[PDB]
Ligand binder design. Structure first.
Ligand SMILES: Cc1cc(-c2ccccn2)cc(C(=O)NNS(=O)(=O)c2ccccc2)c1F
Ligand code: NA
Ligand SMILES: [Zn+2]
Length: 268
């Protein structure tokens, strides 16, 4: 029997996939997770006793973003190994294609939290390889189900690209993406590229956004905004065609924005 239900903070959440928690944890009707330190527990009693004891009220690592009650914590896999393993086991409950849970040393983890008077409540995260040969600026990205489709995933996507900008590189998410990750990236790429086209070559868009050119081109192909000429993709759009796509209904939700002013992060 596998873990199929968890209790984290004030949420109960059904699992989507097998996650390799130890055998005795899976057997339980559900797992109980501290929302701050990510310790997983077998019983409501041990969970309740932990809530009385745990002094964590936020992720470990360094708070590299804070604007109002939105916060990002950066957590090195080698410095905080238990915590990151727990994060990975939690994430594999909702990620089919994630394969790495216990070897967390090569990754850094970016934890999105919503803060209130009692603490910084975990919303989701993305991992990132410390040195990615393939140039991927996201390895796995995961919004917990109660927070999905509410702007947090978009926030985390924008954030991964703000880091890629500060590193003076382009990046792309590691593939395959979930069905919901595909739609989220496509929607984000559209948004960003359309806004820049309204406000330019494919290389310019790439440098301005840190989106790779492949991702730009394939997004413009699906928007039908690219011509082909003698082997080169070329941007073919009129200022009104862009505005037609933008003011359409599928971009009308007000984002949680990444404010670069509030991103205290230096590239190493
Ligand atoms: C990258 C990503 C991944 C996942 C995910 C995948 C598997 C398991 C759990 N989570 C969820 C979201 C999410 O929640 N997307 N919705 S969104 O933030 O409102 C939004 C709106 C407009 C453009 C972009 C994003 C997401 F972005
Ligand atoms: Na659920
Ligand atoms: Zn705890």
């Amino acid at each position: 029997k596998y873990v199929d239900k968890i209790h984290i903070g004030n949420y109960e959440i059904d699992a989507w996939y097998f996650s390799p928690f130890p055998e005795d944890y899976g057997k339980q009707p559900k797992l109980w997770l501290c929302e701050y330190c990510l310790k997983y527990m077998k019983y409501e009693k041990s969970y309740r006793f932990h809530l009385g004891q745990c002094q964590w009220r936020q992720p470990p690592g360094k708070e590299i973003y804070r604007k109002s009650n939105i916060s990002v914590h950066e957590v090195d896999g080698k410095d905080h190994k238990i915590y990151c393993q727990n994060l990975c086991l939690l994430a594999k409950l909702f990620l089919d294609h994630k394969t790495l849970y216990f070897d967390v040393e090569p990754f850094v983890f970016y934890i999105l939290t919503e803060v209130d008077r009692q603490g910084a409540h975990i919303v989701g995260y993305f991992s990132k390889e410390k040195e990615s040969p393939d140039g991927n600026n996201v390895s796995c990205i995961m919004i917990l189900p109660p927070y999905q489709r509410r702007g947090y995933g978009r926030f985390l996507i924008a954030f991964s690209y703000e880091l890629s900008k500060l590193e003076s590189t382009v990046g792309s998410p590691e593939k395959p993406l979930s069905d919901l990750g595909k739609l989220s990236y496509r929607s984000y790429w559209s948004s960003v590229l359309l806004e820049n086209l309204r406000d330019l070559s494919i290389k310019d868009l790439s440098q301005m956004t840190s989106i790779t050119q492949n991702d730009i081109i394939s997004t413009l192909q699906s928007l039908n905004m690219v011509k082909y000429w003698k082997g080169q993709h070329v941007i073919c759009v009129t200022p009104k065609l862009v505005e037609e796509h933008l003011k359409s209904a599928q971009y009308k939700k007000p984002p949680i924005t990444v404010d670069s002013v509030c991103l205290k992060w230096a590239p190493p």
